[PDB]
């Protein structure tokens, strides 16, 4: 049948041109029944047509096609244990997804596929129903209803062929579990192929570690009960004898570095075979070769096994490739930060020979910077160059600025209000800026700070700070005096090493003191400064301005930032006065912390802490009485009331400025006082020493699910604080406050738990020793952040 024209009826999405091209028949050619059938089948196979009918009109060949309705949405209902996103991913992987059409005959196929997925995940009685909702313009919505049913769990895990080790011990190291006691959360009792493979690998590694090189897993069997509610797993294995590592031999194109590889391969003859050591030696050889430029030093190790003597000899083949040079270094994704910020953290230099360890170090430094979420590295090859490569870093940025405010309560502080704002990356330049303010029942504090990290190419940092403070000691568990100060500081910082840091700077401060009730130590200090106040009424004022030089060193080597298991930390700070200032003195403080694991799993651990501090004047003057040290509390020595250990106060018999009955006054001349009065009000001292030892245990009854957010420990802490200027001879009727041998000791227990709201801490201690004059407290509760 000759065809003069081609016409279509029902085309909505597919263009006429596409249909004409897909049709083997074209205008101006003879057509028979076979060609029409072929065209119909081609239209059906397009995947976008439901019904097709190619008939012949009077002169024109007319095709009626009913397009499959376009899928507009896919809804789900009954996916409790299956997330909607993953199910949609599976559906689109199968082929059905949004935008395509719906085949009105594959509903059963999709339902059975989803049922098979439910069978794989564990549920075997699941039912899936598909509902079709037509909508105008030949659209359709496919809804899915799921009856999950009941899942299945493992009822027994058995191993056959093992004699040296009990089955329970082996299962103890398996991810899959068969018993879940209510008092412990060890894991779910579901079955997964990935978990089974992990358990098999763990068993193989466990057997190999003991020298069972010939260990082989014969097979694994999984069975279900007739009710299909229980899973039984069996493993058939074969444990053999052990083997010894007779020696190691190396042969290959070592490139003249044979002398430096023998030391790495040294071993003790007769040592047990171990693959981890072989891998470590291969990695060490690769790193040694790469230190000289080579990028791909292929290394292969093959063991030769002699069963007669049960010996293993390792043959090492080394193929060192050619040197590779770096032509360019590219950064992408830094839409906010400028190029220099990322480029100054690099360890690999552009235009030099390649080293992979340097690239890894640069990636680690970028990750540590904290401005990005994810960091990836790629090493592309230059087209046509056999020894040229380019290094590309891909990063994703993160928000850095922050603003905070809040309220809190404290036993002695009362109601506290705090606020602040900070920006760690100012306009993508690296500058850091911050402002903070705080107010409680006895002090007000305002702080502003700016910092530039790279003041020099090497990495020296420069910072400045301004502060205003107004404090009263009325409710500070001390004597009474009001201070008002303001000052500024400038500092420079040097990264002397990877694990060490140094700081040096200058500072200026202005202080004003008022409301100084008559007392012994304060009057002694004022006399040393030259002032001559009377001992009759409390009315004084003292203004001073000081310039000081500050220095400090820090060493950090912890293995973690939270709940560390092994490491040490040391901090030292010091301050000196510059000539030309009213005051003249020096001050030094040191803190040390250390951790030590006991077992091989780093679980039972020991913690040690020490804190020391000393300062004094230089030119015969005295150190200010507002720079003294205080000991006693929940941070220095638990079991005692805050700021209790140390010398006490002594008041002159004096007349109060305004006496009001129904109250009490210390050594009041109006009341009839005529001699110095002893008391129990802490004043402080200019020398301190505190030590603490703690033993940290895993947990009483919690499981490995959340074993990284709780801690329990028993602590024993000792301390003391004293003043070295107290004159014992003149005042022989009061304790000796210049004796550094009245060490307080205490012991107790503590528990800590990280919570989404804050780090809740509880502790209970009982001071088995305490000198007279000091109070004591038992329970410490910390609920919230700062």
């Amino acid at each position: 049948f000759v065809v003069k024209d081609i016409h279509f009826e029902g085309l909505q999405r597919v263009a006429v041109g596409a249909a004409l091209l897909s049709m083997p028949v074209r205008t101006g050619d003879t057509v028979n029944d076979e060609d029409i059938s072929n065209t119909i089948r081609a239209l059906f196979a397009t995947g976008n047509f439901e019904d097709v009918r190619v008939l012949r009109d009077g002169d024109t060949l007319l095709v009626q096609v009913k397009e499959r309705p376009t899928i507009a949405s896919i809804t789900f209902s009954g996916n409790k244990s299956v997330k909607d996103d993953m199910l949609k991913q599976n559906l689109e992987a199968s082929g059905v997804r949004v935008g395509e059409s719906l085949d009105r005959t594959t509903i059963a196929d999709i339902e059975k596929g989803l049922e098979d997925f439910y069978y794989s995940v564990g549920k075997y009685s699941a039912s899936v129903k598909a509902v079709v909702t037509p909508l105008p313009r030949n659209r359709v919505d496919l809804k899915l209803v799921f009856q999950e049913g009941v899942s299945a769990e493992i009822q027994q895990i058995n191993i056959v062929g093992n004699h040296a080790f009990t089955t329970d011990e082996l299962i103890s190291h398996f991810q899959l579990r068969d018993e879940v006691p209510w008092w412990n959360v060890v894991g779910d009792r579901k079955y997964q192929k990935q978990k089974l493979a992990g358990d098999l690998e763990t068993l193989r590694s466990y057997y190999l570690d003991r020298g069972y090189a010939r260990f082989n897993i014969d097979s694994t069997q999984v069975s279900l009960t007739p009710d299909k509610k229980g899973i039984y797993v069996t493993v058939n294995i074969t444990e053999g004898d052990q083997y010894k590592l007779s020696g190691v031999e190396v042969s290959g194109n070592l490139a003249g570095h044979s002398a430096e590889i023998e030391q790495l391969t040294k071993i003790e003859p007769g040592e047990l075979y171990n693959g981890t050591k072989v891998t470590k030696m291969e990695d060490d050889i690769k790193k040694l070769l790469g230190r000289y430029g080579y990028a791909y030093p292929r290394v292969q190790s093959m063991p030769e096994i002699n069963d007669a003597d049960k010996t293993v000899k390792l043959r090492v083949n080394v193929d060192a490739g050619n040197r590779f040079y770096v032509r360019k270094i590219r950064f992408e994704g830094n839409d906010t930060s400028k190029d220099a910020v990322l480029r100054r953290e690099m360890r690999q230099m552009e235009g030099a020979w390649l080293g992979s360890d340097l690239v890894d170090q640069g990636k680690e430094r970028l990750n540590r910077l904290g401005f990005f979420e994810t960091v990836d590295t790629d090493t592309q090859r230059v087209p046509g160059s056999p020894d040229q490569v380019d290094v590309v870093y891909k990063v994703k940025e993160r928000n850095t600025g922050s603003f905070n405010f809040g309220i809190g309560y404290g036993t002695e502080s009362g109601v506290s209000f705090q606020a602040g704002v900070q920006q760690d990356n100012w306009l993508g330049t690296g500058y850091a800026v911050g402002i903070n303010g705080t107010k409680n029942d006895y002090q007000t504090y305002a702080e502003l700070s700016v910092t530039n990290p790279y003041f020099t190419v090497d990495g020296v940092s420069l910072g400045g700070r301004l502060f205003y403070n107004d404090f009263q000691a009325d409710d500070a568990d001390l004597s009474d005096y009001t201070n008002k100060s303001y000052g500024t500081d400038v500092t420079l910082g040097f990264p002397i090493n990877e694990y060490n840091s140094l700081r040096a700077g200058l500072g200026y401060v202005h202080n004003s003191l008022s409301n100084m009730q008559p007392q012994v130590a304060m009057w002694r200090y004022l006399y040393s400064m030259g002032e001559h106040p009377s001992t009759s009424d409390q009315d004084n004022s003292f203004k001073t301005d000081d310039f000081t030089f500050n220095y400090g060193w820090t060493y950090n080597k912890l293995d973690r930032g939270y709940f560390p298991t092994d490491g040490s930390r040391v901090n030292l700070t010091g301050k000196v006065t510059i000539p030309g200032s009213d005051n003249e003195y020096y001050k030094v403080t040191l803190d040390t912390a250390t951790y030590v694991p006991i077992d091989d799993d780093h679980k039972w651990v020991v913690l040690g802490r020490t804190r020391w501090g000393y300062g004094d004047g230089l030119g015969g003057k005295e150190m200010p009485f507002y720079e003294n040290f205080y000991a006693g509390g929940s941070s220095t020595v638990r079991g005692f009331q805050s700021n209790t250990i140390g010398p006490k106060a002594v008041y002159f018999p004096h007349q109060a400025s305004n006496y009001d009955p129904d109250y009490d006054y210390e050594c009041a001349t109006q009341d009839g006082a005529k001699d110095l009065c002893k008391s129990d009000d802490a004043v402080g001292g200019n020398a301190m020493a505190v030590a603490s030892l703690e033993f940290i245990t895993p947990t009483p009854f919690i499981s490995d699910k959340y074993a990284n957010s709780v801690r329990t420990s028993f602590f024993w802490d000792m301390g003391t604080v004293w003043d070295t200027n107290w004159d014992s001879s003149q005042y022989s009727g009061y304790p000796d406050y210049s004796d550094p041998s009245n060490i307080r000791m205490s012991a107790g227990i503590a528990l800590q738990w990280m919570s989404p709201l804050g780090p809740l801490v509880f502790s209970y201690a009982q001071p088995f020793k305490k000198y007279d004059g000091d109070k004591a407290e038992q329970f410490q509760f910390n609920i919230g952040k700062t």
Binding site: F403, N404, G406, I407, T411, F779, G784
Partner: peptide
């Protein structure tokens, strides 16, 4: 001793 705080932080 009842040291406590309820502070919120909001990134900006």
């Amino acid at each position: 001793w009842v040291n406590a705080f309820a502070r919120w932080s909001k990134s900006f």
